Design a protein around this ligand. Structure first.
Ligand SMILES: Nc1nc2c(ncn2[C@@H]2O[C@H](COP(=O)(O)OP(=O)(O)O)[C@@H](O)[C@H]2O)c(=O)[nH]1
Lengths: 427, 422, 422
């Protein structure tokens, strides 16, 4: 019933999702380069369309790039069905306005036809997952139009977006803050939940928690993929009690515009028996809630939580969960009105490279610092109108650039006001 | 045979089912395939339907708004035992909202559910009543169980309806919207059930952990304790006991006013596997254990509150002269109002478990229930007054006055249970 | 409930606060967030205010002339426990001078401080008294605590005021101007407090080091011992004890003359973590330990000096026939004047600490206090007579006769305590 349709938009979107799909295929027991399997485990129907002995991942692959199909065959074999891959003609040169306005009506109609076919092979739609990168030209503007279009066709369906935000210190292109704000404005309006990730945080993790020396994006994507595979464990491995995407939206989002979540996982293990059997839920909870495993450039132990959820995997003792979470409640800071704090869940099936593991998600007021940095960089460039012609000559009015900024500021102000008011909601 | 129909609603009520039903199968000498295993004992007919063949069929219905609790129970944990034509499954689940279970989604399944119930009712000449086992946490349990109860009471008004309401923990089972579903559903249980048992999972977790301080237990112990309490409550409805002979007698013994029907329980030895080796529990210790803090499946101290009714059901030989001295010896730990005699009733029935010398369970109508309700109500108010997560309920039809009504009903219920405290 | 208001003044009084309040929270079964944790025991109302919600609020005010002691306590060590509207913060601190705390800086905060105190007073029907916890070392403690005490006594003259005066060490806590602040502030405590407890940090350091000669301790032990002594002194004000039932009774039992109110204490086992494993401390050893040199938190030998009053408060079962033989067995180690009966009073109250069989604390009115005062006074005179560091006080208004007056008052106080020695 809780069938998931993934949408992958742009180069980052496809590489991250690619790593995810190949890890999913390892846990369920499917060949990552063929889709062919004889003996599989878990509820494979949530993510794969099985025809004969081939498990076909349910995904819509989208680009503006002229040769997206060949670019996939070369890395992912025949795992993805070519009928689901939508190729483009020219491309968006890191310009939100091209991905969003000047993309071609036909390109979008084909994406929608593919989505309709994928939702037509389901007894029910459990939700959509969008994987993309906010500073690009297709994963930002086209991915944003797709969220708009999907939410208009399928309102009341939980959309989760996983996206890469600018890094806190160094930036990629000068245009990046314009692409990032308009992408964020559309995430604010259309996603049910958004997971904020960035590369600076992930690199520190790759260099300090993984054994890899001099990691590249290929290694960095295994941290993101690990977040994605763990967050879908309960869905994939069922259980009498479990978590679907609609359970996460209901429990983590207290207001409709405060859905931006942080993510953290531990242990991080590269394939092979390179891990150590710590086997302790208490240690994993202490780690997942520390600042060192957070996959975004923020410092959550200094903020305040509105809500959080923790999913434990493997043979975790009930007694250790209760003690470990008691420690977490004592050490961290929560807002009074939400009085229960957490959503807790367990899935008895172990991740393939560790007997135990933990994934945590949550609403931490600290997240505004990511948005505030983006806002400030935009304001300086916008005031001087540097690289601005690239957006207004591609269909935007100054009004749209200003309204997108205003919406972002509204979310920041709402998170901060709530957080400051919170200090006295206890007296 | 006064027959009882058991309905399991929601993910937890269903999770419990295999433990509840395995206990009954072993207790009456039936295998898990429904086949007889030697001599059948007890009034088997009250809980099992006899097939056209030698197989016994549990007289039960399983309801889930998603497909998964049922799929695991009937395909992996207790294969071939449950009748697939008595399982009701939706697709969407409940997104943890009361609103789906009671107003927007679960309502489309009521024709299917009432049709299956009638098919089950039609197989019995003398129906005593219904037992509905449900979580009050999640939307399927919190929402549908009262929707189902109302539909039954309006069709079969002369039957006794009992619910087994399980309150989720503030830790392992927690949810950020638990207080909304708990208050919204207590509001309906108040008019739906004749008898409503409240079991608190936090008490189970601390009680078992205390008993287990000397060992590694098993992760299955928490579910076995919860399932066992229902089995023991029902023991007198299955054996020819001199107590709680029928659901109608439980109602007359424990509930003096239509609203004051929320009951607490106490159990000893909790589980056979918790009390192993030398367990000669003398009649004297068993009765002291049953009013001990570590045997009460609620955050209740009997000494702090007032009893309205109290029934102690023991199993095995329990000489009456001992039971009477144990009761007199309760002193002022067990106290009632000045408008009641100390109406404490105790006796014993048949033991089926070869590892225990004796055992027992109590049913209490005690003002301490009001403290659980106030705890949950305070949490409700903090969230409600600042609109936390209310959009998710309003989007599915819960006009705001619906929350306000539940708030007022529960505060009145708390006020009424505490009348004797003042 | 006879309610007590606790005020923490200065960097050390504030440093202590998290240990003092955590002990009370655990002792009465309250969590550190003010939430109830099971059954509440003792007269909780005497130290905690009940919120409009289920939360308990410590009935306390924190005063600091700088921002830092408070910031660390309320933001890092015991988050969400202390009410921020009860915290008073200055900017300049005190430059370690009495003069700032009492004349030039701290005076501008008195309207704010008395306003917060009244807001706290207005929440209670029956106010028993105030406890002011302060250092007598640094200027904020040494200066403001007496400024605050005078302001309160002039407004609420019928209440009993107790101070907990902590004398800094000559090593880890030392300062080059310690003798000025100590004499200048003892001069005001003399007329301000009804009861004044003196705790000497040098005794704590040597006592703990002695107990720790077999292990590595913890650096937190010094603060836990100091905080615990206050908690134990106050145990009888929180539990329904047959001793020191109220602050007024402590005053009548221990202070025969308005000026002779400076008291010494003795404690055993000092800290639970210092006495682990087999700690069956029999009633007999506990009372011998309480008059032992290694349990007295002052440079005082009971055998060398004269008692005016002596109260022993024990916790746990302590048979009275043993307590009486232990007292008789004190012989001439505990001696009073020929104008007094040997008025040694002992009894016991409720134990809350599951790791200890029993425990206790004593309150002594003993002439040995005069020796601490003379020690500090001699140091004062060596500095004063050669003007060391006096410019720093004169620059903020301490006209020289102010020092001379304090010098004479303390020499008179010493003379009076030693009257029975001659
Ligand atoms: N973590 C991660 N980040 C990536 C990856 N590829 C690209 N990025 C980031 O995504 C940003 C936008 O990428 P881009 O190539 O312009 O995507 P497109 O124009 O939307 O197809 C880059 O500036 C990088 O910071 C990847 O494989 N993984």
């Amino acid at each position: 019933a809780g069938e998931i349709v993934c949408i992958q938009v742009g180069q980052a979107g496809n590489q991250i999702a690619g790593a995810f799909w190949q890890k999913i295929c390892a846990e369920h027991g499917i060949d990552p380069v063929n889709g062919k399997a004889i003996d599989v485990v878990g509820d494979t129907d949530i993510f794969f369309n099985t025809i004969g002995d081939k498990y076909i991942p349910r995904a819509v692959v989208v680009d503006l790039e002229p040769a997206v199909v060949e670019n996939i065959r070369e890395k992912f074999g025949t795992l993805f069905d070519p009928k689901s891959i939508v190729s483009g003609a020219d491309g968006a040169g890191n310009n939100f306005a091209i991905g969003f306005n000047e993309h071609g009506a036909e390109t979008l109609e084909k994406v929608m036809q593919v989505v309709e076919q994928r939702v037509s092979e389901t007894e029910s739609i459990g939700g959509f997952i969008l994987t993309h990168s906010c500073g690009g030209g297709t994963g930002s503007g086209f991915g944003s139009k797709i969220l708009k279009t999907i939410r208009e066709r399928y309102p009341k369906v939980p959309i989760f977006t996983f996206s890469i935000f600018p890094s806190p210190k160094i930036s990629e292109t000068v245009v990046e803050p314009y692409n990032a704000i308009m992408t964020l404005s559309n995430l604010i309006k259309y996603a049910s939940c958004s997971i904020v990730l960035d590369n600076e945080a992930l690199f520190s993790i790759a260099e300090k928690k993984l054994e890899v020396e001099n990691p590249s994006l290929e290694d960095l994507n295994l941290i993101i993929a690990q977040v994605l595979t763990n967050v879908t464990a309960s869905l994939r491995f069922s259980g009498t009690l479990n978590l679907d995407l609609g359970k996460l939206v209901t429990n983590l989002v207290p207001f409709s515009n405060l859905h931006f979540l942080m993510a953290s996982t531990a242990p991080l293990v590269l394939a092979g028996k390179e891990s150590y059997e710590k086997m302790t839920a208490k240690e994993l909870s202490a780690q997942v809630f520390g600042d060192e495993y957070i996959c975004a450039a923020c410092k959550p132990t200094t903020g305040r939580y509105l809500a959080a959820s923790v999913l434990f995997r493997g043979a975790v003792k009930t007694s250790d969960v209760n003690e470990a979470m008691a420690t977490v409640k004592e050490q961290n800071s929560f807002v009074n009105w939400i009085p229960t704090g957490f959503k807790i869940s367990k899935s008895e099936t172990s991740p393939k490279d560790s007997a135990l593991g933990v994934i945590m998600l949550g609403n931490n007021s600290e997240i505004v610092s990511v948005f505030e940095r983006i806002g400030a960089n935009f304001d300086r460039l916008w005031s001087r109108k540097a690289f601005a012609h690239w957006f207004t000559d591609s269909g935007f009015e100054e009004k749209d650039l200003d309204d997108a900024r205003a919406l972002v500021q509204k979310v920041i102000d709402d998170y901060r006001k709530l957080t400051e008011d919170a200090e006295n909601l206890y007296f | 045979a006064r027959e009882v129909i058991t309905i399991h609603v929601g993910e937890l009520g269903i999770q419990i089912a295999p433990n509840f039903w395995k206990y009954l199968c072993d207790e009456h000498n039936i295998d898990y395939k429904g086949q007889e295993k030697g001599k059948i004992r007890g009034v088997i007919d009250n809980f099992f339907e006899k097939a056209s063949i030698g197989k016994w069929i549990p007289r039960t219905i399983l309801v889930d708004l998603g497909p998964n609790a049922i799929r695991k129970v009937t395909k992996k944990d207790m294969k071939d035992f449950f009748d697939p034509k008595r399982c009701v499954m939706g697709l969407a689940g409940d997104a943890n909202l009361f609103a789906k279970g009671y107003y927007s989604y679960g309502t489309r399944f009521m024709e299917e559910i009432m049709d299956k119930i009638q098919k089950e009712v039609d197989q019995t000449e003398h129906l005593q009543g219904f037992i509905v086992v449900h979580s009050i946490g999640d939307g399927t349990g919190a929402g549908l169980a009262p929707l189902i109860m109302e539909a039954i009471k309006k069709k079969h008004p002369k039957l006794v309806m009992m619910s087994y309401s399980i309150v989720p923990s503030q830790n392992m089972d927690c949810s950020t919207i638990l207080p909304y579903n708990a208050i919204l559903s207590l509001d309906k249980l108040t008019s739906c059930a004749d008898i409503s048992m409240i079991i608190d999972n936090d008490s189970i977790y601390r009680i078992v952990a205390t008993q287990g301080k000397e060992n590694e237990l098993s992760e299955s112990i928490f579910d076995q304790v919860l399932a066992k309490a229902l089995v023991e409550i029902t023991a007198t409805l299955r054996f020819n006991s001199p107590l709680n002979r029928s659901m109608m007698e439980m109602s007359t013994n424990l509930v003096p006013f239509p609203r004051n029907h929320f009951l607490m329980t106490s159990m000893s030895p909790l589980e056979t596997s918790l009390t192993s080796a030398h367990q000669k529990i003398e009649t004297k210790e068993l009765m002291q254990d049953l009013i001990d803090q570590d045997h009460i499946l609620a955050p209740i101290t009997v000494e702090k509150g007032v009893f309205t009714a109290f029934v102690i059901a023991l199993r095995g030989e329990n000489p009456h002269s001992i039971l009477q001295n144990s009761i007199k010896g309760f002193g002022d730990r067990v106290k009632f109002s000045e408008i009641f005699p100390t109406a404490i009733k105790a006796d014993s029935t048949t033991l089926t478990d070869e590892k225990l010398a004796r055992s027992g369970i109590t049913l209490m109508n005690h003002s301490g229930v009001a403290n659980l309700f106030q705890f949950l109500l305070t949490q409700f108010e903090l969230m409600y007054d600042h609109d936390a997560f209310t959009t998710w309920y309003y989007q599915e039809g819960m006009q705001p006055s619906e929350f306000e009504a539940a708030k007022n009903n529960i505060q009145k219920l708390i006020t009424e249970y505490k009348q004797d405290e003042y």
